[PDB]
Design a protein around this nucleic acid. Structure first.
Ligand SMILES: [Cl-]
Ligand SMILES: [Mg+2]
Ligand SMILES: [Mg+2]
Ligand SMILES: [Mg+2]
Ligand SMILES: [Mg+2]
Ligand SMILES: [Mg+2]
Ligand SMILES: [Mg+2]
Ligand SMILES: [Mg+2]
Ligand code: NA
Ligand code: NA
Ligand code: NA
Ligand code: NA
Ligand code: NA
Ligand SMILES: [Sr+2]
Ligand SMILES: [Sr+2]
Ligand SMILES: [Sr+2]
Ligand SMILES: [Sr+2]
Ligand SMILES: [Sr+2]
Lengths: 81, 119, 46, 65, 194
RNA sequence: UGGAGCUUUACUGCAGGCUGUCGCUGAG
RNA sequence: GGCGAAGAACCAUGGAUUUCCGAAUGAGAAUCUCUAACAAUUGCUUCGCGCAAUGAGGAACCCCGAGAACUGAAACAUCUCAGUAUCGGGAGGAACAGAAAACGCAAUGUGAUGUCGUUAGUAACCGCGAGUGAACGCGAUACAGCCCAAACCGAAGCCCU
């Protein structure tokens, strides 16, 4: 059975979405839907997902841009990992 | 149908079957075309039964004429399973022969007669 | 043109496949990517 | 590695599933640190974590969970 | 004494004489409005069926098959050919209609194996043969002392390799002596000259 | 005593059409 | 950087896991998608996909069908190349054949079938041209003989559980 989240996507652009928009980015399995990515995240880091945006990258894997609720602080979550 | 040259009245058939049962519980009966045939050929047959719903007909076509050149009387039954049931079988039967009945010796004696009149 | 999800995975692979042979592999083997390709000079399948 | 088959066999069906989710999370935090070009690692472990999870799953199958 | 079967046999010696001639005139009308391969509950020729191997048992199937009469439906050459090979009308196929019928019957039943077959007449354009087919995977057949041999893996599709009764006669194997030189033990083995 | 395309009342054949006959096909 | 005396590596056997497309089988699709599936054809059938079968692969070999031409004949049509190339269908570890309506060294003889050696380029074929071409028998290899339909019996029977 495949897992949804593969690893955080840390790049200058990812850092901004985190600082300025409370969004975290991950490399996910390309069979995962936005909904499956949202649930996966809330359970892995215990946070609330407001919105998810996905893109099928030219690297072969799927990238997801998860925006957290104003109740959580992206930077903080990203920091522990 | 092609081997049938006269129609038997439902009533007459009902009689004949009733007689075949007492002939199998008292006298002697042959179940099956081959046994019936040998019977007619050996002379032991007194009354032979032939179903009318036999497909293919090759199985019985011969009876009618064979029976004639043996003086053996024969009667038709509209259905194959009825005759088999009467012969005491859990399956249908295309032909049955009463080989010396019992307690029916008279009852069937007239059946043979009634048929003759029926051409 | 428009690419399907599968066509994208393939092109994606062909891209990664188009790399230098790790500097260290040349040491380990005491001294070439024969499948190195160029977008203009070569032609991929499909 | 630090985790032996005997130990996995001694565990309870529920302790393995607990040791699994525990191991999976460490592997995840390793790949996370690796994704960020992390340094403080021990490569020979991110490798051991995979075998570990392979063992528990192989044992789980063995014991009927 | 003669058996009931000998009568079915006797009648089929001359299918255009007596009652059967009448019976055939009947049936064929229905047969003509029928498929290419039709499963039937009982052999039309009981004596023949039993004689070929038939048995009133599970895993035993019978089927009538229609096939066109005549020579080969051949296409005229589309490239150069010497006079000897420009032939079209008189060319006949090396397989006989009956073998062709067994093969079509067999395709309809991808799981059964042909046990034998026999003809049941023909009109001016058709030819009908009934094919006895067996289910090699059904017990009652496996456990049968007379047919279990047809369950052997060696018998997978025996008809397409000409192991059928009709197959072997057609192959020229009927004689054990004179004339079966290029025939036995197989056509292909003799350089295909039989 | 090569090849191919084309022609014809060249040689030899093969489709195709027409026509007779047998089967299908039976009663007066 | 890690693992190994908690005996690793490595080897043998057995087991686990085994993405998607693929005979490819819920429907569709350039390896993905869409809303529970033996698709399709069959057998049995509790007539319900409940129990089963087929499909496709394999170096060639093997069996069953379809079947050229270049070429040779110093041309060429029969013949030859050749039942070859190639095509369609199918089986196995080998296939096919096989226990005489045989042979016919004609006999007071042989005794299922392959194959090998020989019989023999003999007999036979053939614009009787070019060419084509067996068999019986013999010596070997290996050996093995049986089962139905029917007669006379007639449910004394078989399959699933
Ligand atoms: Cl078959
Ligand atoms: Mg999108
Ligand atoms: Mg027996
Ligand atoms: Mg020319
Ligand atoms: Mg020449
Ligand atoms: Mg051979
Ligand atoms: Mg000459
Ligand atoms: Mg000879
Ligand atoms: Na290009
Ligand atoms: Na089949
Ligand atoms: Na021949
Ligand atoms: Na030309
Ligand atoms: Na079903
Ligand atoms: Sr990249
Ligand atoms: Sr019945
Ligand atoms: Sr260019
Ligand atoms: Sr097959
Ligand atoms: Sr012997």
């Amino acid at each position: 059975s495949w897992d949804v989240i593969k690893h955080p996507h840390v790049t200058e652009k990812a850092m901004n979405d985190m600082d300025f928009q409370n969004k975290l980015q991950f490399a996910v399995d390309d069979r995962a839907s936005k909904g499956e990515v949202a649930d996966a995240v809330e359970e892995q880091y215990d946070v609330t997902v407001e919105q998810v945006n996905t893109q099928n990258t030219m690297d072969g894997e799927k990238k997801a841009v998860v925006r957290l609720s104003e109740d959580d602080d992206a930077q903080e979550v990203a920091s522990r990992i | 149908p092609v081997y049938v040259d006269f129609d038997v009245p439902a009533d007459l058939e009902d009689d004949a079957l009733e007689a075949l049962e007492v002939a199998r519980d008292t006298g002697a009966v042959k179940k099956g075309t081959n046994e019936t045939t040998k019977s007619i050929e050996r002379g032991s047959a007194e009354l032979v039964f032939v179903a009318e719903d036999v497909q293919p007909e090759e199985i019985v076509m011969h009876i009618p004429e064979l029976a004639d050149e043996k003086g053996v009387p024969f009667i038709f039954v509209e259905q194959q399973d009825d005759l088999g049931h009467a012969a005491g079988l859990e399956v249908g039967s295309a032909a049955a022969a009463v080989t010396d009945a019992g307690a029916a010796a008279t009852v069937l004696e007239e059946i043979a007669d009634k048929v003759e009149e029926l051409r | 043109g428009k690419k399907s999800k599968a066509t994208k995975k393939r092109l994606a692979k062909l891209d990664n496949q188009n790399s230098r042979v790790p500097a260290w592999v040349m040491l380990k083997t005491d001294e070439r990517n024969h499948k190195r390709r160029h977008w203009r000079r070569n032609d991929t399948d499909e | 590695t630090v985790l032996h088959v005997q130990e996995i066999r001694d565990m309870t069906p529920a302790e393995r599933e607990a040791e699994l989710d525990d191991l999976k999370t460490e592997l995840l935090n390793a790949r996370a640190v690796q994704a960020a070009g992390g340094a403080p690692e021990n490569p020979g472990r991110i490798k051991e974590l995979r075998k570990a999870i392979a063992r528990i799953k192989t044992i789980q199958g063995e014991e009927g969970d | 004494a003669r058996s009931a079967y000998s009568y079915i046999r006797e009648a089929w010696k001359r299918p255009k004489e007596g009652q059967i001639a009448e019976l055939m005139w009947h049936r064929m009308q229905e047969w003509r409005n029928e498929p290419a391969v039709v499963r039937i509950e009982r052999p039309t020729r009981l004596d023949r069926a039993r004689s070929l191997g038939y048995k009133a048992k599970q895993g035993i199937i019978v089927v009538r098959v229609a096939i066109r009469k005549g020579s080969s439906r051949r296409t005229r050459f589309n490239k150069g050919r010497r006079s000897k090979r420009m032939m079209v009308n008189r060319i006949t196929r090396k397989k006989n209609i009956q073998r062709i019928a067994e093969e079509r019957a067999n395709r309809k039943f991808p799981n059964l194996r042909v046990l034998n077959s026999y003809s049941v007449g023909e009109d001016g354009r058709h030819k009908w043969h009934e094919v006895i087919l067996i289910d090699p995977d059904h017990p009652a057949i496996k456990s049968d002392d007379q047919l279990s041999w047809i369950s052997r893996t060696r018998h997978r599709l025996r008809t397409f390799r000409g192991l059928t009764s009709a197959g072997r006669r057609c192959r020229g194997l009927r004689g054990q002596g004179k004339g079966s030189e290029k025939v036995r033990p197989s056509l292909r083995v003799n350089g295909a000259k039989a």
